Amino acid sequence: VMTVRDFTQVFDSYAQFEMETASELGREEEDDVDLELRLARFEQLISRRPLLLNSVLLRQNEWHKRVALHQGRPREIINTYTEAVQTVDPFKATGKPHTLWVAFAKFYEDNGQLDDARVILEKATKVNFKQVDDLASVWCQCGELELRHENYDEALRLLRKATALPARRAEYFDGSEPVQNRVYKSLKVWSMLADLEESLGTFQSTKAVYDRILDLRIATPQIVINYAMFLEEHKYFEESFKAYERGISLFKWPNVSDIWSTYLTKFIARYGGRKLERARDLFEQALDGCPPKYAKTLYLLYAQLEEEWGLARHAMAVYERATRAVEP
Amino acid sequence: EVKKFVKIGRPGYKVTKQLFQIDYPEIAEGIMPRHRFMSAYEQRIEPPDRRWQYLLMAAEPYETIAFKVPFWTHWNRETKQFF
């Protein structure tokens, strides 16, 4: 056939008497050519079931993988899942092939919970230099599957093994993205490994250093999680200084250094001795720069702490010194 | 100077023969297109079998409408169409 509606003629004949070329025309010209004509011919031969018009006609004019897989979802084309898990169109993609290995692992879950789940996981794990978080996110999705299977011990096996194995290559090889982008990724990777702090325990006292070398560049988002973990596993002066410098030395405009000053003062009190020289001295050394981050957040520590010191004289010296720096 | 400031931008000739018509961008200049049909003997290669000739109407802002050849014209400027 060389024209259209020849499809419908063949359909009428086969129907009164009741074809991948119709699919080749279901994936036809790009922008609004038919997207429905060969679809209607194959889907109204008489009518039996398209079962592929949806997938092919939605891959004609990413998420075309879902556009396919939702056609015959649970088990109707249960054998055609082989084709339906495919989104290849061989090209460069970001989140798409890692998402695709994750989706074939979910298909494996529905198919037997192991039949190609870790197969697809390892397949995507044997990819090019990391340099990007799509691969780390697919491997950590596989690790989330590990922690999901409720197997605590072997889930920690998978977490440790293939979440400290990215610690050999988390990011920074090549690309038009020049920022390494390993810090937050491998922070979430350590989160999935241990010290998730909301689900699992069994993190050692060295878990704080694990989180530190799990950032390995900086932890600006996770100064909070690092502070919590450090004052849980240690609850000491190293933890206090860790949280302080975690907010202070990571990023300016103190969305971190305000909470860092709070951590420094409150920890130097409730771990390192109360009302002492260390609290107020570290407080001054932390909030020296301390612009009006919110309104004025560099006196609300030292003035009140010099008043808690108990001495009217030092409290008054610090009160004049802070009121001469109240509202600049 | 006509050739020393001759920017060769490489736009195309989008014309139909069959009476030769082209579409072209507006250079904003009083120069109208100049055409001529000549012999195919001048080029930086000169492949043999040079008896077929170049009928070309060239202008400033467009790649000129040239072709084999085997006033009586004009260019509508507010509409940007050469006939």
Partner: protein, 187 residues
Amino acid sequence: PEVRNIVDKTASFVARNGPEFEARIRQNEINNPKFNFLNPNDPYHAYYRHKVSEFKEGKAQEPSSAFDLDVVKLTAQFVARNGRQFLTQLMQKEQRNYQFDFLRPQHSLFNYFTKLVEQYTKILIPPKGLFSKLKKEAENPREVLDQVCYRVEWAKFQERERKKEEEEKEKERVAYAQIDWHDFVVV
């Protein structure tokens, strides 16, 4: 298409107000990657800065002898009185058993016949000698001075027209004499 709509949106805002508003908005929202497409930080950098050019220039779409002279005088007398395009006093003279040698338009004498007809019309306009005659000519050297100056002004405009036409033709001839002579090619 979130990143697509972001690149196209920054493209419309930069097709309207430009990379200066890019620097402004990036300094205002460079804490969050919602402006990372207008900054070096997102993958929509190239697509964005080019789509601004596209939607600005008009490539992108909104995001979604005495005897012969006497005979000519008689031809003018007939063309002054010919009152219909197909009815006149000369339709009979053409095929009415005589010679009609000024009746040709392909004869060059047709042009002198047209001039004689213009003269008969210059006599047949009511202001030309039918029933009204104005004396601003018979006793008017001031209107005559006005008319001399009017001819002179037409002459000045015409001299300018001739000079501009000569210049335009010379420039166009030089342009054809410098037109593309090497890259002859067809599409």
